[PDB]
Amino acid sequence: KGEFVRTKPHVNVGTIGHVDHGKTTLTAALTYVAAAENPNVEVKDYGDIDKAPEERARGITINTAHVEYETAKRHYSHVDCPGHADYIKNMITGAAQMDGAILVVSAADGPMPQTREHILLARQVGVPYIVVFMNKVDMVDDPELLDLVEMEVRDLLNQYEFPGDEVPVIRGSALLALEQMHRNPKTRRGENEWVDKIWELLDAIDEYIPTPVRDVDKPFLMPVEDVFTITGRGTVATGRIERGKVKVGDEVEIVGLAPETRKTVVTGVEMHRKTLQEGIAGDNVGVLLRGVSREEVERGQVLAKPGSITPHTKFEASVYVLKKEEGGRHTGFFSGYRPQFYFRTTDVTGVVQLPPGVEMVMPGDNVTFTVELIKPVALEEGLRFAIREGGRTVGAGVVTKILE
Numbered sequence: 001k002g003e004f005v006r007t008k009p010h011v012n013v014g015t016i017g018h019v020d021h022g023k024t025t026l027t028a029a030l031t032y033v034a035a036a037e038n039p040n041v042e043v044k045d046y047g048d049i050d051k052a053p054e055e056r057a058r059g060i061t062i063n064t065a066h067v068e069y070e071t072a073k074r075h076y077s078h079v080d081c082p083g084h085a086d087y088i089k090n091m092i093t094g095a096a097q098m099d100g101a102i103l104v105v106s107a108a109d110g111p112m113p114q115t116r117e118h119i120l121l122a123r124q125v126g127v128p129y130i131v132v133f134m135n136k137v138d139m140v141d142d143p144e145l146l147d148l149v150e151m152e153v154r155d156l157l158n159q160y161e162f163p164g165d166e167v168p169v170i171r172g173s174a175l176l177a178l179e180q181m182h183r184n185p186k187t188r189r190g191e192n193e194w195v196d197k198i199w200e201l202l203d204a205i206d207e208y209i210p211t212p213v214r215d216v217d218k219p220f221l222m223p224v225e226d227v228f229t230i231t232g233r234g235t236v237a238t239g240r241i242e243r244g245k246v247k248v249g250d251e252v253e254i255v256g257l258a259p260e261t262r263k264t265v266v267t268g269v270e271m272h273r274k275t276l277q278e279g280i281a282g283d284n285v286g287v288l289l290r291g292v293s294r295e296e297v298e299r300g301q302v303l304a305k306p307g308s309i310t311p312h313t314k315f316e317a318s319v320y321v322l323k324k325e326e327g328g329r330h331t332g333f334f335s336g337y338r339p340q341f342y343f344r345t346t347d348v349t350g351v352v353q354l355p356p357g358v359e360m361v362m363p364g365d366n367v368t369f370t371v372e373l374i375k376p377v378a379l380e381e382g383l384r385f386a387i388r389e390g391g392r393t394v395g396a397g398v399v400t401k402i403l404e
């Protein structure tokens, strides 16, 4: 829709939470509610978000979706994540883009295993703040149950070092708000009970999730979240720009996952299908890459200023191994354990090598060991990561030292 005009600060948010708790319905409601007060917002219905044939077939979100909305204060890109246990990988890549997450929890069900898992994982890809939306209150008459659900959620957040007692917990119905906006798309704040709860959420997002300190002077770095072919344009890599700036005509390097880095020229930069003169740190963009196909760039690589990043394969890490009560392993593991490691949008198999004398690591252990990744990836000291294996989260770590 033409050129992107920067009128206000930009923040990346998104929806996480257990399967079916109402993330996508809420995402759609946010677009409709905000669109009444700001005509730059294009509304997105439920089927515009869960749009893929496989999402229709399976009846769940599978792919992250990005939607745009804005308030008087700020412009938002919103990443809606799947809740299903089998699509955690996609959720991780989504959370890796968020400056703050909206944790959706059904009032009728309370916190559930992916409520816990998403909180834990959001932390490990750097989500700094969480707002809670307690959804489906239209289904729950009993005030006592609502208070219990809120108490449990606040306590759950405390377990993962979020300020659980301080987070806003907004109670409402994404569906009833969305219904009201369908019957009157011009419904303004103060007119409807359910719509006003969405405004309470928007207010909490505005005021509780700060605009991050970003650095546009450091070398360009954009973790790639997705890649696709646009008919008649070419290959687009999407992602949140971590730092620096990118302009059409810039040479960039595609770093990680391949034996060697390759260079390409950026031939387009857009945010929400609007042309950007310059992509800057924080922007949620699509970057058109010349001379590469969608088989030559992939999720988990990073786009970088040429020569600015050396990818790595081997590192030391401080790792907490989840207890089974946290959805972790029942039993311990040995050197040669071979799980998946998640750094930002990157997912890669790695080999655990314990010190001489450390035979075994048990659930509950805080331990240090060495990991050798099977492919090079953009890494740095202090970077947090998650460890998963066999479809479950088994560990949380931070890179302490880069060895190679």
Ligand SMILES: Nc1nc2c(ncn2[C@@H]2O[C@H](COP(=O)(O)OP(=O)(O)NP(=O)(O)O)[C@@H](O)[C@H]2O)c(=O)[nH]1
Residues within 6 Å of the ligand: 017, 018, 019, 020, 021, 022, 023, 024, 025, 026, 059, 060, 061, 081, 082, 083, 084, 135, 136, 137, 138, 139, 172, 173, 174, 175, 176
């Ligand atoms: N009664 C009621 N039902 C709701 C509400 N919000 C969502 N639902 C229902 O809950 C179901 C799941 O909604 P959905 O938005 O797809 O949830 P999700 O969290 O995005 N699912 P997933 O984890 O697969 O992405 C749908 O049947 C939807 O109609 C609400 O406020 N009230």
Ligand SMILES: O=C(O)c1ccc(Br)o1
Residues within 6 Å of the ligand: 230, 233, 236, 268, 269, 270, 273, 286, 287, 288
């Ligand atoms: O359709 C897209 O998402 C797109 C096209 C060109 C760019 Br850059 O992003």
Ligand SMILES: [Mg+2]
Residues within 6 Å of the ligand: 022, 023, 024, 025, 060, 061, 080, 081, 082, 083
């Ligand atoms: Mg969904």
Ligand SMILES: [N+]
Residues within 6 Å of the ligand: 049, 050, 051, 055, 061, 062, 063, 064, 065
């Ligand atoms: N989706």
